[PDB]
């Protein structure tokens, strides 16, 4: 669930909280308009990966509850999760670690939407 | 869904642009904290009533088309609308016109949420 997936960045990003990414660019929080750049895009698939999780059966990806470990910022789900966590997971994860390697620019952060997200 | 929920704004609220409300306070955007003032709340509720909505199986609120209709200022749900749609459209229904009778104050747009909210 996206409680896990808040701990998840921060494993991968411990400088960081994931408040940074709630609002940045014209996706990190919610969805629309073109991407910023490299990290305002890690959150364009990470929705795109939930959209494709909610298609299995029963997937609540902000509500199924996984299990996985963090590890020096290293992540690794488990393998007793159902199809439907394990998916997740591994959204989130790929997405923790496309956080971590991707630049945060502060100019991106907290930006007026209605201006650059149409 | 998405785009039924901007006509109702947009019925209830024609002297703004539905954008007004896609980064206002700390819940037009949907998140969490303390709400900033009554629109915010109003959004507060919104959210909420979405994740209530969520609880009722294969049920996307934000996905979910129903039937309703919105003329001028006046939102009216209809009946052919099963729980999921029913419940969805009552949610924005409820929020679209809670907007209604919030003052909207600029200052509460585009706010640091990640130093105001949590
Ligand atoms: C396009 C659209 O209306 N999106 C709504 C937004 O207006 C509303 O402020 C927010 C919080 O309730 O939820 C979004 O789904
Ligand atoms: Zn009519
Ligand atoms: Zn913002």
Same mark, same amino acid.
């Given at each position: 669930?996206?409680?896990?997936?808040?701990?998840?960045?921060? +494993?991968?990003?411990?400088?960081?909280?994931?408040?940074?990414?709630?609002?940045?660019?014209? $996706? +990190?929080?919610?969805?629309?308009?073109?991407?910023?750049?490299?990290?305002?895009? +890690?959150?364009?698939?990470?929705?795109?990966?939930?959209?494709?999780?909610?298609?299995?059966?029963? &997937?609540?990806?902000?509500?199924?509850?996984?299990?996985?470990? &963090?590890?020096?910022?290293?992540?690794?789900?488990?393998?007793?999760?159902?199809?439907?966590?394990?998916?997740?997971?591994?959204?989130?994860?790929?997405?923790?670690? &496309?956080?971590?390697?991707?630049?945060?620019?502060?100019?991106? $952060?907290?930006?007026?939407?209605?201006?650059?997200?149409? | 869904?998405?785009? /039924?929920?901007?006509?109702?704004?947009? *019925?209830?609220?024609?002297?703004?642009?539905?954008?007004?409300?896609?980064?206002?306070?700390?819940?037009?955007?949907?998140?969490?904290?303390?709400?900033?003032?009554? =629109?915010?709340?109003?959004? /507060?509720?919104?959210?909420?009533?979405?994740? /209530?909505?969520?609880?009722?199986?294969? *049920?996307?609120?934000?996905?979910?088309?129903?039937?309703? /209709?919105?003329?001028?200022?006046?939102?009216?749900?209809?009946? !052919? !609308? !099963?729980?999921?749609?029913?419940?969805?459209?009552?949610?924005?229904?409820?929020?679209?016109?809670?907007?209604?009778?919030?003052?909207?104050?600029?200052?509460?747009?585009?706010?640091? =949420?990640?130093?105001?909210? !949590?």
């Amino acid at each position: 669930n996206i409680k896990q997936f808040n701990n998840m960045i921060e +494993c991968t990003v411990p400088a960081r909280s994931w408040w940074d990414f709630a609002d940045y660019g014209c $996706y +990190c929080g919610s969805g629309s308009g073109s991407p910023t750049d490299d990290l305002d895009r +890690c959150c364009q698939t990470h929705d795109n990966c939930y959209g494709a999780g909610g298609g299995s059966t029963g &997937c609540a990806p902000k509500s199924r509850t996984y299990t996985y470990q &963090c590890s020096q910022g290293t992540l690794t789900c488990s393998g007793e999760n159902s199809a439907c966590a394990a998916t997740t997971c591994d959204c989130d994860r790929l997405a923790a670690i &496309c956080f971590a390697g991707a630049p945060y620019n502060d100019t991106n $952060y907290n930006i007026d939407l209605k201006s650059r997200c149409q | 869904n998405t785009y /039924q929920f901007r006509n109702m704004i947009e *019925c209830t609220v024609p002297s703004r642009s539905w954008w007004d409300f896609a980064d206002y306070g700390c819940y037009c955007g949907c998140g969490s904290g303390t709400p900033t003032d009554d =629109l915010d709340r109003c959004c /507060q509720v919104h959210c909420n009533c979405y994740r /209530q909505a969520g609880e009722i199986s294969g *049920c996307r609120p934000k996905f979910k088309t129903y039937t309703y /209709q919105c003329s001028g200022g006046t939102l009216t749900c209809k009946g !052919n !609308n !099963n729980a999921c749609a029913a419940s969805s459209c009552d949610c924005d229904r409820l929020a679209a016109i809670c907007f209604a009778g919030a003052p909207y104050n600029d200052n509460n747009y585009n706010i640091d =949420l990640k130093a105001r909210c !949590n």
